[PDB]
Structure 1
Amino acid sequence: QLTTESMPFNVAEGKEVLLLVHNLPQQLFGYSWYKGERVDGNRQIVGYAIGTQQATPGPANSGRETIYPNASLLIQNVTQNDTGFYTLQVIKSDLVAEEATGQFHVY
């Protein structure tokens, strides 16, 4: 199963967290990250197109995140308010979506 996991789960204020992503399918066309536990357009952080390697910031983009070619999401300068769930959507070459949710806590 597609999974995402924070490294570290417990994150000091002002430091960084990497959302690692595991069990990707091959032949992917894009990624989309969201704040919260589901796919919710109003809370899209970033979208990525594999074909062109272009990142497009969404309405939940903070300016403090980077999505990598392997789907992982690095968040820097973390704030208390960053504590939450983060949902990844992967779009395969047949346009079928897979999703995973992960989370971290800022202290």
Structure 2
Amino acid sequence: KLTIESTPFNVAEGKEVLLLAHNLPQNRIGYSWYKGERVDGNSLIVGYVIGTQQATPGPAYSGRETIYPNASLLIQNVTQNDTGFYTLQVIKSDLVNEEATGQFHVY
């Protein structure tokens, strides 16, 4: 089952956090990361097409996020407003998509 691990969980203001996706589906074709606990267009950080490596920012994009081909999301120079839940949707070739939510906490 797709799960998100934040490392570290407790992240000092100004430092960075890496959100790792474990158990990716084999027929993955893209990713979308969202701020909060749900898929929601108003909270899209970044979308990503694996094959072209094309990242597309959304309204929650800060310029401090980087999405990697294994779906990991690095957030740099974190602030108190970055604190909380992040949700990954993995888009698959059959569109039987999967989601997982992770969390970190800025201190």
User: Structure 1 residue 28: deviation in Å?
Assistant: 1.1
**How far has the Cα of 1:103 moved from its partner?**
0.4
> What is the match of residue 21 of structure 1?
21
Counterpart amino acid of residue 9 in structure 1:
F
- Aligned equivalents of 2:101 and 2:59: distance in 1? 19
Amino acid at match of 1:28: R
| C-alpha deviation, 1:96, in angstroms | 1.6
**Match in the other structure for 1:49:** 49
- TM-score, length basis structure 2: 0.98
Aligned to 1:9: 9
> Do structure 1's residue 60 and structure 2's residue 69 form an aligned pair?
no
| Equivalent position of 1:31 in the other structure | 31
Task: Give ranges in structure 2 of 5+ residues lacking alignment.
Answer: none
Which whole-Å CA distance do the structure 1 matches of 2:36 and 2:13 have between them?
A: 20
- Corresponding residue of 2:87: 87
Shift of 1:94: 0.8
Structure 1: any 5+ residue segments left out of the alignment? none
SS at match of 2:81: helix
Question: In structure 2, what is the Cα distance between the partners aligned to 1:33 and 1:74?
Answer: 11
CA shift, 1:80, in A, is 0.9
Number of paired residues?
Answer: 107
Matched AA of 1:49: V
Distance 1:81 1:29 in 2: 30
CA RMSD of aligned residues (A): 0.6
